[PDB]
Amino acid sequence: STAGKVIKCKAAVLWEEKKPFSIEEVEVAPPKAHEVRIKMVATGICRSDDHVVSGTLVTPLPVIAGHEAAGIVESIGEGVTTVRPGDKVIPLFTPQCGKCRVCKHPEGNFCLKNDLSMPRGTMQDGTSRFTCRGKPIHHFLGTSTFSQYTVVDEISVAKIDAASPLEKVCLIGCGFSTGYGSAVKVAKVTQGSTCAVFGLGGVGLSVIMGCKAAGAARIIGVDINKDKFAKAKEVGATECVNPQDYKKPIQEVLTEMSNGGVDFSFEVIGRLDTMVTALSCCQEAYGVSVIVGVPPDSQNLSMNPMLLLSGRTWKGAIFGGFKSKDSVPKLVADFMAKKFALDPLITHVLPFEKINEGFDLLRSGESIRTILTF
């Protein structure tokens, strides 16, 4: 009943940094060639959405943020072959065009069509599908999931199991897959190893889940908020440390705890200082450190390259290294077969209209993931 028509719906528009979202009517254009219009069902609040608000992650404003979500296809543009109306789908904030040198590479996942490295806040064709108060509104990472309806490029959507519980599997669209893949795929955590995870939010807990799945013997959670420790232990941390409790810097503490440095460390916060601390705490000759946290816009870290010369490996990744369109449906299938759990990440559920309360919960330290239902 809406195919080929403009849809008026509610979205959460961010007009200005450091302000609440405005829940108000937008116009959503119909999908053009190779585009998909999705009726959203559930979306998570990821710290990267907050980074848009805080100016940590710069993207053009005004904007419809949201990137961790699931929904149902309402209509498809001309030439779409990979989804149909009524399919359950997860928007892919990292696209998989299948054609660029990264998509063709066996390891690569950061498709060259992404809108993260130099955000423009458009569709692939450089235009917007959103109008609000007669004004064009930017997209976010090609997804814009804080809206009852969004339009995405076909390379930014994956079809998932028709029997999927969308209020759970939305987390496969960012935080779970990112953390789990950062452990199992990017770091390649080994059986019997010692891991250190800096930051025990939704992504860091997913890193712990991956470290445990990989058979780590020790998984040391690190957070300045000790309220995060109980859940971290529930999902596999063997011990938790708060840097504020120690006179010495936590890299020294972790090196001593691990009898000379950890096998694998993960920065899952987004601070320059913890990226360097996380590198330093891995064993100097054979340790691996993975950066997951999003750094503050345009800021450089300072480090001593002797940390690398001794033999450390330092890497980072987007979306856990997963090729997004290949991987998302398989992760959903694995979830359905109980290969991993998502409930430990979900601490709060709210209607979409209470999005601002959801962001308050994140900023206060109370929540891990709040799931918003449309």
Q: Is position 200 annotated in a ligand binding site? A: yes
Q: Annotated binding residue at 312?
A: no
Calculate helix-pair angle for 355-364, 47-54, nearest 10 degrees: 90
Distance CA 362, CA 198 (A): 17
Q: Angle 272-281/250-257 helices, nearest 10 degrees? A: 20
Catalytic residue (choose from 147, 164, 174, 193): 174
Q: Which of 46, 195, 240, 281 is catalytic?
A: 46
Binding mask 183-202 for ligand NAJ (x = CB under 6 A): ---------------xxxxx
Q: Does 284 bind its own copies (CB under 8 A)?
A: yes
> Catalytic: 282?
no
Q: Please name the helix (run of DSSP H) or strand (run of DSSP E) that holds residue 202, with its range, or none.
A: helix 202-213
Of the listed pieces 40-48, 120-128, 220-228, 301-309, which binds its own copies according to CB under 8 A? 301-309
Among 197, 291, 342, 355, binds its own copies (CB under 8 A): 291
User: Is 338 a residue that touches its own copies (CB under 8 A)?
Assistant: no
Report the distance separating Cα 361 and Cα 311, nearest Å: 41
Selected from 2, 313, 347, 373, the binder of its own copies by CB under 8 A is: 313
Q: Which of 18, 259, 338, 343 contacts its own copies by CB under 8 A? A: 259
Beta carbon nearer to ligand NAJ, 28 or 355 = 355
Which of 7, 97, 189, 371 touches Zn ion (CB under 5 A)? 97
Let me know: does 3 contact 29? Beta carbons within 8 Å. Answer: no
240 as an active site residue: the answer is no
Based on the shown chain and the rule CB under 5 A, indicate whether residue 100 belongs to the binding site for Zn ion: yes
Q: Which of 163, 27, 10, 162 is nearest to 86 (CA)?
A: 162
* Minimum distance, C-beta of residue 135 to ligand NAJ, in the bound complex (Å): 27
Q: CB–CB of 129/28 below 8 Å?
A: yes
Query: At its nearest, how many Å lie between Zn ion and the CB of residue 332?
Result: 17
Euclidean distance between CA atoms 91 and 328, whole angstroms: 10
Residue count of the chain, please give it.
Answer: 374
How far, in Å, CA of 257 to CA of 191, rounded?
Answer: 19
Site for ligand NAJ contains 178 (CB under 6 A): yes
**Contacted by 200, from Zn ion, its own copies, ligand NAJ, none: CB < 5 to 8 Å by type:** ligand NAJ
Dist CA 193 CA 215 (whole Å): 8
Output 28 or 97, the one with its CB closest to Zn ion: 97
**Binding of Zn ion by 268 (CB under 5 A):** no
Beta bridge partners of 158: 90
Q: 199 labelled as ligand-binding?
A: yes
Interface region with its own copies, contact rule CB under 8 A, candidates 62-70, 166-174, 313-321, 336-344? 313-321
Q: Does 279 bind ligand NAJ (CB under 6 A)?
A: no
User: Does 54 engage in binding with ligand NAJ (CB under 6 A)?
Assistant: no
How far apart (Å, rounded) are the C-alpha atoms in residues 221 and 281?
A: 13
Judge residue 111's burial from the number of C-beta atoms within 10 Å of its C-beta, 0-12 exposed, 13-18 middle, 19 or more buried: buried
Least Å distance, CB 297 to its own copies, is 9
Contact (CB, 8 A) for 252 and 227: no
Closest CA to 370 of 177, 201, 239: 201
Q: Is 195 annotated as a binding residue?
A: no
Q: Which is nearer to its own copies, 30 or 296 (CB)?
A: 296
User: What span, in angstroms and rounded, lies between the C-alpha atoms of 158 and 328?
Assistant: 7
Residue 138 bears catalytic tag = no
Q: Residue 180 is encoded by which pair of tokens?
A: 């789990």
Measure the CA dihedral 362/10/53/171, to 10°: 50
Q: Do 193 and 163 meet the contact criterion of CB atoms below 8 Å apart?
A: no
Question: Any known ligand binding at 319?
Answer: yes
Q: Which of residues 261-280 bind its own copies (CB under 8 A)?
A: 272, 275
Q: Which stretch binds ligand NAJ (CB under 6 A): 75-83, 118-126, 267-275, 297-305?
A: 267-275
Q: Is 304 in the site for ligand NAJ (CB under 6 A)?
A: no
- Please report, in range form, the residues annotated as the binding site for Zn(2+): 46, 48, 67, 97, 100, 103, 111, 174
